[PDB]
């Protein structure tokens, strides 16, 4: 018959990695999570308690509950034609903070600093990001850079 | 070439007979292998040949391959 267990098809997903097996380092236990933090989920195969299901591997969610050794995380799961709210109790070995959130907060504080310093002059702050604009005019010189003519190479076996 | 051309009839599909630019069953070219074997940095094996490298311990590189260091 068919087989769809709780950890089916999780072979390479829950292998550890090359040459970093063994016990886990103490930074994962010394990291501090608060309610509202945004965290990434990546399971550790060395810890069998508090494991996430294989669906939530690589998923990103929001902390809603902090307990003794675990963290409650909220994920949005697509079920059919809508998203449902899923609450997960995961031990802290299987989560880490999302770095995109802290990058955005750094942008927020630097952006507020720019607005605060330029408010003393009113110099059209222009605080929105802009994407890659087309590159403008330039003059390239041939002083020591005379062009070299290239041609297609004929065919050879090369074995 | 005639032996390979006779052997090609026993195979399905299309095969080509190409005269390689390499020396024997090695992977260097003919003048590259010639300018390598004029120095002592090649040394024969049962059918193949072992080559000298600039890496490794100098004691092993001198017990093997003596004629190149005999400069």
């Amino acid at each position: 018959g068919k087989s769809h267990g709780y950890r089916s098809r999780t072979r390479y997903m829950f292998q550890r990695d090359f040459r970093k097996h063994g016990a886990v380092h103490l930074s994962t236990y010394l990291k501090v999570y608060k309610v509202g933090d945004i965290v990434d989920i990546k399971a550790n195969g060395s810890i069998q308690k508090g494991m996430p299901h294989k669906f939530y591997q690589g998923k990103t969610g929001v902390v809603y509950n902090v307990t003794k050794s675990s963290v409650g995380v909220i994920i949005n799961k697509m079920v059919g034609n809508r998203y449902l709210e899923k609450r997960l109790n995961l031990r802290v070995e299987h989560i880490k903070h999302s770095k995109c959130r802290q990058e955005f907060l750094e942008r927020v504080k630097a952006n507020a600093a720019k607005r605060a310093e330029a408010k003393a002059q009113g110099v059209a702050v222009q605080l929105k990001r802009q994407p890659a604009q087309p590159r403008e005019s330039r003059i390239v010189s041939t002083e020591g850079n005379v062009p070299q003519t290239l041609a297609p190479v004929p065919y050879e076996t090369f074995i | 070439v005639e032996g390979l051309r006779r052997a090609r009839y026993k195979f399905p599909g299309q095969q080509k007979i190409i005269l390689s630019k390499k020396w024997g069953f090695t992977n260097l070219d003919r003048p590259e292998y010639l300018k390598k074997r004029e120095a002592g940095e090649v040394k024969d094996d049962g059918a193949f040949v072992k080559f000298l490298s600039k890496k490794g311990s100098l004691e092993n590189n001198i017990r093997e391959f003596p004629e190149y260091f005999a400069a």
Binding site: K20, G22, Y29, K68 | L58, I62, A70
Partner: protein, 294 residues
């Protein structure tokens, strides 16, 4: 030819942690010590780290951060001459005095010393520093004995007893103290008090000085050089205890020099690395030497 390791072995080998390779840290014990209840968010957990080397006892109060461990206060056994203890700097009572010193020092620098005076009149009874009402809780600290063996009579528990009588709230039971009867599950207080005041070394001093005098000159030579007899060590432990309860303030040494003054001599004495060009010159000379037909 026999003790040879392949390149495949050395490529697939995974090294342990550096402290495990040095054999100094039990990470299985460290994880259970330094981790915190996550609902106590940034609350530090404090370890009384007690380590026994030859000729020293090291007591520290240590919390853990990601960038490394942080020490509130440390107390070594080699600063006991300031309090009047000159000989036996690693005996069970020296461990007691070091624990008492680090307890009084931490409560002084935290300001929790006018309350929680600890056990002023010591008798060898088993009790913990209980919380006084309508005030702050006592300072809570946990042992880190490291790789040292737990054993009834070991002096890590003497350091524990000294720190507990100094006013720290350290959780412990009494079944590892000297004087614990195994069959009758109770603690004998007078033998523990004798050990606090050095009875086990003074009784040996008497029972070896009465018969074997060459041993009494080989060991306990410093006791004869400083005329310390068997009965006076009890009162010098008492005077050391009251000197600790007077001032644990930890004046450091004067260092006799500067950091760069030590660094000049040690930088002169240390060996340096060989650069790439002189390494190439060395191997060219070696090729011209042995492979140059002698």
């Amino acid at each position: 030819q026999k003790d040879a390791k392949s390149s495949a072995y050395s490529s697939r080998f995974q090294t342990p942690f550096r402290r495990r390779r040095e054999g100094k840290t039990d990470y299985y014990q460290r994880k259970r010590l330094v981790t915190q209840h996550k609902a106590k968010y940034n609350t530090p957990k404090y370890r009384l780290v007690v380590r026994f080397t030859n000729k020293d006892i090291i007591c520290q109060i240590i919390s853990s951060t990601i960038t490394g461990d942080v020490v509130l206060a440390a107390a070594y056994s080699h600063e006991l001459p300031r309090y009047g203890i000159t000989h036996g700097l690693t005996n069970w009572a020296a461990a007691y005095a070091t624990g008492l010193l680090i307890a009084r020092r931490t409560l002084q620098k935290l300001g929790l010393d006018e309350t929680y005076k600890g056990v002023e009149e010591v008798e060898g009874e088993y009790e913990l520093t209980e919380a006084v009402e309508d005030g702050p809780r006592p300072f809570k600290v946990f042992l880190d004995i490291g790789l040292q063996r737990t054993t009834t009579g070991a002096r890590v528990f003497g350091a524990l007893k000294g720190a507990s009588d100094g006013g720290l709230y350290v959780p412990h039971s009494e079944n590892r103290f000297p004087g614990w009867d195994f069959e009758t599950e109770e603690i004998d207080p007078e033998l523990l008090r004798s050990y606090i005041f050095g009875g086990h070394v003074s009784q040996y001093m008497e029972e070896l000085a009465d018969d074997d005098e060459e041993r009494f000159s080989e060991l306990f030579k410093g006791y004869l050089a400083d005329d310390i007899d068997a009965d006076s060590l009890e009162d010098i432990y008492t005077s050391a205890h009251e000197a600790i309860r007077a001032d644990p303030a930890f004046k450091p040494t004067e260092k006799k020099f500067t950091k760069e003054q030590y660094a000049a001599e040690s930088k002169k004495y240390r060996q340096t690395k060989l650069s790439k060009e002189e390494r190439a010159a060395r191997v060219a000379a070696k090729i011209a030497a042995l492979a140059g037909q002698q």
